[PDB]
Amino acid sequence: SLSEIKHWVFDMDGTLTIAVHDFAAIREALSIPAEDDILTHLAALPADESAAKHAWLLEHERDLAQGSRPAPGAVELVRELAGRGYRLGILTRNARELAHVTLEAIGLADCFAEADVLGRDEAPPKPHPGGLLKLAEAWDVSPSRMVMVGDYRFDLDCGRAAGTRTVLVNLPDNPWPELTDWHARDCAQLRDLLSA
Amino acid sequence: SLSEIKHWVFDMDGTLTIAVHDFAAIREALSIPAEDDILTHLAALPADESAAKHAWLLEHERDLAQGSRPAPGAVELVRELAGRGYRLGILTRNARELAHVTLEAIGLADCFAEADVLGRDEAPPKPHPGGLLKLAEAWDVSPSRMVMVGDYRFDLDCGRAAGTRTVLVNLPDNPWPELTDWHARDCAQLRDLLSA
Ligand SMILES: [Mg+2]
Ligand SMILES: [Mg+2]
């Protein structure tokens, strides 16, 4: 079961943190009334208008970005696992130094050994298994007793290639059933799953 | 009128070109049926599910990107203006070298003098007016007889700061009426407007 896994690895972006965007600039650009939610308002527009506005939003994702925040339930999950004495790692395309800064910013830096935060320079790009194998070696543990937690297909492919169990979070359903051992809408539901 | 303007400046990203994304990966990740359009399907989902899936899409905009393509009507507009003997420029945050490559790829490199394609190293970031003032100087023309064409607020602010007329394209309405002299849903409608 999930609770028997005592070695956990997380993707960073999209899993533990998510990008936040400039709501006021979006509302202004897309002519959203103050009384309306942005997405709800867009879904209710005529199809062609909704499509043009959604396209503009995606096109300007980086222009509109304002750093990142912890994903729902992420801090709570990591603290729960750390409280158990579990061993926790990170596998990210980010430079280790940025990953470190991010961990400090969200108050989780003390839950991961610095050597177990693997960035751009410490491991090949997902879905290559190198990074998970590096942690498996450092921890001297069977990959079958580790879990890779992510929100994107290359996270699941990476776990499957290395032989770890896999978890999908931050999508509401199960789009890759063969690649995914457990799925949860977010880290808060994952914590609940773990508990049960 | 618009047709009296013989000096035109364009933003690049979002105006002449737009990012394209991996439709098959999106469909797989978001569980979209083959018979459905991605956006139409998402708008029809329960609110919470639609929101989670739209959030994931925005979060992975760069992961899903597959270069860029010309924006609707952009090639046709630029060729029409060049055919008139009009003077055309680019003001972009992109490195000039990338802008050049992009122009070559979309078959428009011959419509702009190389010196009039202004990139990262040739002009300060929008909305600073430096870049438009640089073109105005090179062309020896009143900014009031130039137009800046863009799809984002900093393009309009840049034109207003330099004193050029401004055009909004690639949004379907008029969100910044005081900043915008003419607006069109895209470059094809702008060409039509120009003609009329
Ligand atoms: Mg990710
Ligand atoms: Mg732009």
Task: Explain what the structure shows.
Chains A, B: One of its GO terms (molecular function) is hydrolase activity. Two copies of one chain form a homodimer. With 196 residues, chain A is α/β, with parallel strands linked by helices. The first copy, chain A, folds into two domains: 1-17 and 70-196, Rossmann fold (3-Layer(aba) Sandwich), CATH 3.40.50.1000; 18-69, 434 Repressor (Amino-terminal Domain), CATH 1.10.260. In chain A, 41% of the residues lie in helices and 17% in strands. Chain A contains nine helices and eight strands. Chain A has helices at residues 23-29, 38-44, 47-59, 61-64, 74-83, 96-105, 130-139, 153-162, 187-195; strands at 7-10, 17-21, 65-70, 87-91, 117-118, 146-150, 165-168, 182-183. In chain A, α5 (74-83) packs parallel to α9. Chain A binds chain B through residues 13-14, 18-19, 21, 25, 28-31, 39-40, 42-43, 47-63, 151-153, 170-173, 175-176, 185, and chain B through 13-14, 18-19, 21, 25, 28-31, 39-40, 42-43, 47-63, 151-153, 170-173, 175-176, 185. The site of one magnesium ion has 7 residues of chain B, from loops.
- Number of helical runs of chain A? 9
Which chains have the largest interface?
A-B, 41 and 41 residues
Number of strands of chain A: 8
Q: Per CATH, what is the topology of the largest domain in chain A?
A: Rossmann fold
What coarse outline of chain A follows from CA principal-axis ratios? elongated
Oligomeric state of shown chains: homodimer
CATH class of the largest domain in chain A: Alpha Beta
Structural class of chain A: alpha/beta
**Overall number of structural domains of chain A:** 2
Give me the CATH superfamily of the largest domain in chain A.
Answer: HAD superfamily/HAD-like
Query: In percent, how helical is the residue content of chain A?
Result: 40-55%
Approximate strand percentage of chain A: 15-25%
Order of helices and strands of chain A: EEHHHHEHEHEHEHEEH
